[PDB]
Amino acid sequence: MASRILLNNGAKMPILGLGTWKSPPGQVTEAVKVAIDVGYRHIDCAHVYQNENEVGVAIQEKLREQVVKREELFIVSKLWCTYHEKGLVKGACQKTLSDLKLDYLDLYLIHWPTGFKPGKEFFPLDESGNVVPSDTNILDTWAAMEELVDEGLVKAIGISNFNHLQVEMILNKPGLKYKPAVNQIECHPYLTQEKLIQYCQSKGIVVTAYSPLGSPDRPWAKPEDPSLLEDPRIKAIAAKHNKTTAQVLIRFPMQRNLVVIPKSVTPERIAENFKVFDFELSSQDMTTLLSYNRNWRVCALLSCTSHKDYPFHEEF
Ligand SMILES: NC(=O)C1=CN([C@@H]2O[C@H](COP(=O)(O)OP(=O)(O)OC[C@H]3O[C@@H](n4cnc5c(N)ncnc54)[C@H](OP(=O)(O)O)[C@@H]3O)[C@@H](O)[C@H]2O)C=CC1
Numbered sequence: 001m002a003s004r005i006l007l008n009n010g011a012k013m014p015i016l017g018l019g020t021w022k023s024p025p026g027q028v029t030e031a032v033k034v035a036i037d038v039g040y041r042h043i044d045c046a047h048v049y050q051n052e053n054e055v056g057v058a059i060q061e062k063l064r065e066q067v068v069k070r071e072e073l074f075i076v077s078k079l080w081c082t083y084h085e086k087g088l089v090k091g092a093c094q095k096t097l098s099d100l101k102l103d104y105l106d107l108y109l110i111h112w113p114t115g116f117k118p119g120k121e122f123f124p125l126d127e128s129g130n131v132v133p134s135d136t137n138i139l140d141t142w143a144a145m146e147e148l149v150d151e152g153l154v155k156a157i158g159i160s161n162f163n164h165l166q167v168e169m170i171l172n173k174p175g176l177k178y179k180p181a182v183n184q185i186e187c188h189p190y191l192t193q194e195k196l197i198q199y200c201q202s203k204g205i206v207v208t209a210y211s212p213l214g215s216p217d218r219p220w221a222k223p224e225d226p227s228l229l230e231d232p233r234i235k236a237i238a239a240k241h242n243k244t245t246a247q248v249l250i251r252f253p254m255q256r257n258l259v260v261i262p263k264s265v266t267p268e269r270i271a272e273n274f275k276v277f278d279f280e281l282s283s284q285d286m287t288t289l290l291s292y293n294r295n296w297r298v299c300a301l302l303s304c305t306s307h308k309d310y311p312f313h314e315e316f
């Protein structure tokens with residue numbers, strides 16, 4: 001297939017990117033350098049990952065070395081939950097631009113639909129461990145994001161972890177100026193998201209699949225948890241194609257016309273994960289992989305389940 005997908009702002013987004021959540025600051029600079037050398041052109045970042053400065057060091061080194069030009073890169077970051085207030089959005093974006101050492105972002109996402117109390121804590125909790133919400137709503141935050149496009153700080157804006165009703169609220173916003181370009185959501189064979197993906201695609205919103213390998217390094221992983229990389233049924237599909245299970249898991253969302261952002265800090269896996277343009281999964285393979293759905297969600301937090309905008313009470 002084509003290596004880039006067209007967004008509604010007319011820009012082309014590479015369908016394979018590098019994830020950076022949990023990538024330690026002491027290893028992420030090398031990871032991004034190696035990724036750019038072997039062909040990656042899309043990096044997924046966030047302020048909350050606490051490593052944007054070091055990601056920026058890698059990008060600057062490869063620009064200075066003339067391995068790539070800025071126009072060829074697609075850099076994504078996300079507005080954290082403590083900055084949903086209208087007057088905090090520009091400042092949060094500027095801090096990210098400063099750390100990444102860039103003068104614009106290709107895409108900036110609302111990280112989660114839930115606004116939290118502003119302050120220095122990323123997850124402000126009350127005395128009994130509930131997240132403290134802010135009185136912001138999704139629509140006012142969206143208007144502040146639209147301002148960033150008009151001021152030239154970002155080329156495209158989008159959302160992440162929004163359910164279909166929350167997407168709908170934005171699409172029906174009075175005075176909507178820029179539609180969301182992308183909805184970035186958890187997606188893998190144990191959480192296939194057919195309903196939400198169909199909804200988004202029908203509205204012309206591109207879907208990015210996160211945790212495509214099932215996030216085995218997530219901090220709350222338990223030893224008894226399901227493992228996609230070790231699923232013998234997926235191993236057999238990989239073996240039939242002479243590819244690794246990770247390569248099958250990355251190729252899967254690509255054939256559903258999704259963008260996919262696997263994370264690695266290991267140079268040999270960074271290279272392996274990019275070698276996914278030289279094979280195809282059959283229609284039969286795809287239907288079989290879809291059959292493995294178990295509505296098993298890796299990214300959710302119990303402390304957030306009372307927030308009015310918690311996205312995962314709805315079916316999709
Ligand atoms: N918007 C949002 O709310 C969210 C966005 N994301 C984004 O999605 C990205 C990917 O999701 P993430 O949850 O990090 O996890 P992934 O599903 O990408 O899995 C990452 C794990 O897989 C390992 N791995 C990578 N490649 C291979 C391979 N070829 N063989 C064996 N193991 C491999 C990595 O190890 P190692 O690094 O040691 O090589 C790491 O432990 C995130 O980094 C982030 O950018 C993720 C969660 C939420």
Ligand SMILES: O=C(O)Cn1cc(Cc2nc3c(F)c(F)cc(F)c3s2)c2cccnc21
Pocket residue numbers: 021046081111112114299300301304305307309310311
């Ligand atoms: O958000 C990311 O990209 C990575 N990431 C995901 C999680 C799990 C979360 N679940 C929810 C959630 F269910 C919410 F409603 C709001 C949130 F901000 C989070 S964050 C996490 C926790 C702690 C640190 N990072 C996390």
